[PDB]
Amino acid sequence: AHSFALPVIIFTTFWGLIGIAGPWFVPKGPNRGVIITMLVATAVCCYLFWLIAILAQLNPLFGPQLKNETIWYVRFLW
Amino acid sequence: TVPSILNRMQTNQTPPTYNKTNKFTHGFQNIVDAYGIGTYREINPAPYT
Amino acid sequence: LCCGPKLAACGIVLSAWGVIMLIMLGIFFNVHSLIEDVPFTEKDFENGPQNIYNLYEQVSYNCFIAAGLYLLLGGFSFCQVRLN
């Protein structure tokens, strides 16, 4: 069993630090502007996609349709 | 040893669009340029591409 | 035989990919004795869950056999590229 709150805490911290703290720890070379852009854009794109994937699975309206042999197999597997 | 002095003129013709690229970003700039060359001092989409 | 280094090189890539996939697949069958859930079970299925474990063990063995052939293929293709 899982809660939703904890996944959010762990992945929000992970991607948050990357997009928030990451830019603080960047070389002073000519690519500084590019590196910061990538750090933030990456964290936002990746976090959003995951957040959708997990939220879409909350409060489900229906479960899966499994085949009889599959149902049996799971009963004695998990 | 002629002084060879290069003096700026009142720039007033459309200048070329120069985006500094490197071994990594050059490829991304090209797929942008394939669609078109941005307006002078346009926001370069490549860093987000 | 030479066969052309361009084709021997392709064999090396196919062989390496195959060995990686076949070993990993065989493990998955052996561990979850599963997502694939296609071990070709009997239609006359009785109340014996151990029969399903045994089927997966057979599938796993077959996976490692196929990997062995890819190991032999990679060996041969490798020497062809070195000699070519």
UniProtKB/Swiss-Prot annotation, chain A:
Keyword Chloroplast found: no
Lumenal compartment residues: 1-5, 55-78
Tissue: Expressed in brain (at protein level).
Residues spanning the signal sequence: none
GO biological process: proton transmembrane transport; synaptic vesicle lumen acidification; transmembrane transport
Segments on the Cytoplasmic side according to the record's topology features: 27-33
Keyword Nucleotide-binding attached: no
Pfam families: ATP_synt_H
Annotated transmembrane regions: 6-26, 34-54
GO MF assignments: proton-transporting ATPase activity, rotational mechanism
Residues bearing glycans: N68
Localization, UniProt: Membrane; Cytoplasmic vesicle, Clathrin-coated vesicle membrane; Cytoplasmic vesicle, Secretory vesicle, Synaptic vesicle membrane
Keywords: Cytoplasmic vesicle, Glycoprotein, Hydrogen ion transport, Ion transport, Membrane, Synapse, Transmembrane, Transmembrane helix, Transport
Entry function: Subunit of the V0 complex of vacuolar(H+)-ATPase (V-ATPase), a multisubunit enzyme composed of a peripheral complex (V1) that hydrolyzes ATP and a membrane integral complex (V0) that translocates protons. V-ATPase is responsible for acidifying and maintaining the pH of intracellular compartments and in some cell types, is targeted to the plasma membrane, where it is responsible for acidifying the extracellular environment.
Protein family membership: Belongs to the V-ATPase e1/e2 subunit family.
Subunit composition and interactions: V-ATPase is a heteromultimeric enzyme made up of two complexes: the ATP-hydrolytic V1 complex and the proton translocation V0 complex. The V1 complex consists of three catalytic AB heterodimers that form a heterohexamer, three peripheral stalks each consisting of EG heterodimers, one central rotor including subunits D and F, and the regulatory subunits C and H. The proton translocation complex V0 consists of the proton transport subunit a, a ring of proteolipid subunits c9c'', rotary subunit d, subunits e and f, and the accessory subunits ATP6AP1/Ac45 and ATP6AP2/PRR.
Protein name: V-type proton ATPase subunit e 2
Organism: Rattus norvegicus (Rat)
Gene: Atp6v0e2
Curated annotation (Swiss-Prot), chain B:
Subcellular location: Cytoplasmic vesicle, Clathrin-coated vesicle membrane; Cytoplasmic vesicle, Secretory vesicle, Synaptic vesicle membrane; Melanosome
Residues with PTM Phosphothreonine: T14
The organism's place on the tree of life at top rank: Eukaryota
Positions bearing Phosphotyrosine: Y18
Entry's family note: Belongs to the V-ATPase 116 kDa subunit family.
Reported function: Subunit of the V0 complex of vacuolar(H+)-ATPase (V-ATPase), a multisubunit enzyme composed of a peripheral complex (V1) that hydrolyzes ATP and a membrane integral complex (V0) that translocates protons. V-ATPase is responsible for the acidification of various organelles, such as lysosomes, endosomes, the trans-Golgi network, and secretory granules, including synaptic vesicles. In certain cell types, can be exported to the plasma membrane, where it is involved in the acidification of the extracellular environment. Required for assembly and activity of the vacuolar ATPase.
Subunit structure: V-ATPase is a heteromultimeric enzyme made up of two complexes: the ATP-hydrolytic V1 complex and the proton translocation V0 complex. The V1 complex consists of three catalytic AB heterodimers that form a heterohexamer, three peripheral stalks each consisting of EG heterodimers, one central rotor including subunits D and F, and the regulatory subunits C and H. The proton translocation complex V0 consists of the proton transport subunit a, a ring of proteolipid subunits c9c'', rotary subunit d, subunits e and f, and the accessory subunits ATP6AP1/Ac45 and ATP6AP2/PRR. Interacts with SPAAR.
Protein name per Swiss-Prot or TrEMBL: V-type proton ATPase 116 kDa subunit a 1
Organism: Rattus norvegicus (Rat)
Gene name of the encoded protein: Atp6v0a1
Residues of the full protein shown: 347 to 395 of 838
